[PDB]
Design a protein around this ligand. Structure first.
Ligand code: ATP
Ligand code: YPD
Ligand code: MG
Ligand code: MG
Ligand code: ZN
Length: 355
């Protein structure tokens, strides 16, 4: 109620910073797209705006933007890596502009990402000050910082207008919330592959790509009610986005405060985003997200997240057999540690949110 509302007030974005940040991002992104379009291998590149800024659930400051530099790849053939469900080798069906990145029959993610990064790096010294952050192992992101303030994650994304892979067949369980009609329309849209490599023991399988549905996530968050007029008038202001923002802030704050021994380094905002989509599936009616019930609605979000930690299971919303909380990705000790901290917070009405 009052405490949660006070937090949300604190997390609001300034209309001014949104405006200035937008222009800075546009300038940088427009430059890089222009350069990339010169290269024969990136001719068809195009922009897709994704993540929390464009979903209107960015908190505190508009200082982190996410964009896909998408590139259509006709006639694409996938081989699932190691029954991982989310990671794939990319092949082609019988002049391919991507010829140069092939290793045997296979398009190398690492080869193609490296050139992508190169060109952008090579272009970053040309009206604003932009610096490129260190490459994170196995990440799809090329991360820039503008004016020592605004981070922009750029991922290359292959775009396939084929039907989604078989691994997604039982995902996107929105039928009871957003409708069967909408699920069908959504699954007619493209899917993306980004050069995030599957973990291989201590390293990465460096030719693998991973599915991305960032475009669908954005569409859902910006058209998120059972009612088509959800959040379009003062009588239908649900608390869905408020609950996602609080879950994000809860995790951010816990990560900050536990930074001395880095217990929570393996947890990310996408974990709480995923958990939140599952709670939307469980609670499909707008009446289950009434502004008057902010407290209860947030609790529903927290207790589902707690269940996910304790069962060490958090299914990718689109790929059910991809477990974001597997031992492969996050060790048991870390999940047990966050479980305890979230329980403490829940049991004491979130002291971490006190001013
Ligand atoms: N592990 C992942 N699997 C699939 N998609 C992911 C994953 N991590 C991030 N993404 C996609 O990348 C987008 C941007 O990621 P990012 O970490 O910037 O989070 P965000 O949703 O923008 O939230 P915020 O940036 O406020 O923490 C996500 O919204 C999601 O669509
Ligand atoms: C841009 C961008 O624009 N649209 C989407 C998108 C994007 O960032 C992704 C997509 N799709 C995407 O998958 N990101 C992504 C980035 C990093 C990593 S990690 O494994 O390095 C990592 C694990 C845990 C932690 Cl705590 C921190 C890092 C995994 C995925
Ligand atoms: Mg982001
Ligand atoms: Mg990001
Ligand atoms: Zn709403």
């Amino acid at each position: 109620a009052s405490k949660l509302r006070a937090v949300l007030e604190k997390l609001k974005l300034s209309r001014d910073d949104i405006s200035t940040a937008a222009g800075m991002v546009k300038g940088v992104v427009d430059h890089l797209l222009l350069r990339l379009k010169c290269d024969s291998a990136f001719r068809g590149v195009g922009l897709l705006n994704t993540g929390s800024y464009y979903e209107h659930v960015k908190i505190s400051a508009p200082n982190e933007f996410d964009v896909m530099f998408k590139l259509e790849v006709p006639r694409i053939q996938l081989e699932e890596y190691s029954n991982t469900r989310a990671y794939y080798f990319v092949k082609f069906k019988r002049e391919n502009p991507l010829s140069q990145f092939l290793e045997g029959e296979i398009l190398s993610a690492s080869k193609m990402l490296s050139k992508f990064r190169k060109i952008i790096k090579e272009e970053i010294n040309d009206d604003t000050d932009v610096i490129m952050k260190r490459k994170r192992g196995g990440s799809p992101a090329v991360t820039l910082l503008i004016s020592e303030k605004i981070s922009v994650d750029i991922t290359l994304a292959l775009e396939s207008k084929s039907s989604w892979p078989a691994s997604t067949q039982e995902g996107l369980r929105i039928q009871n919330w957003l409708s069967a009609k909408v699920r069908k329309q959504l699954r007619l849209k493209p899917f993306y592959l980004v050069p995030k490599h599957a973990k291989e023991g201590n390293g990465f399988q460096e030719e693998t790509w991973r599915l991305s549905f960032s475009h669908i996530e954005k569409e859902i968050l910006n058209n998120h009610g059972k009612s088509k007029t959800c959040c379009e008038n003062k009588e239908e202001k649900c608390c869905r986005k408020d609950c996602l923002k609080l879950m994000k802030y809860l995790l951010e704050q816990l990560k900050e405060r536990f930074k001395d021994k880095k217990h929570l380094d393996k947890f990310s905002s996408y974990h709480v985003k995923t958990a939140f989509f599952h709670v939307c599936t469980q609670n499909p009616q707008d009446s289950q997200w009434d502004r008057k019930d902010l407290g209860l609605c947030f609790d529903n979000c927290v207790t589902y997240f707690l269940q996910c930690l304790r069962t060490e299971k958090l299914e990718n919303y689109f790929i059910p057999e991809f477990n974001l909380f597997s031992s492969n990705l996050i060790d048991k000790r870390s999940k047990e540690f966050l479980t305890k901290q979230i329980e403490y917070e829940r049991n004491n009405e979130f002291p971490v949110f006190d001013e």
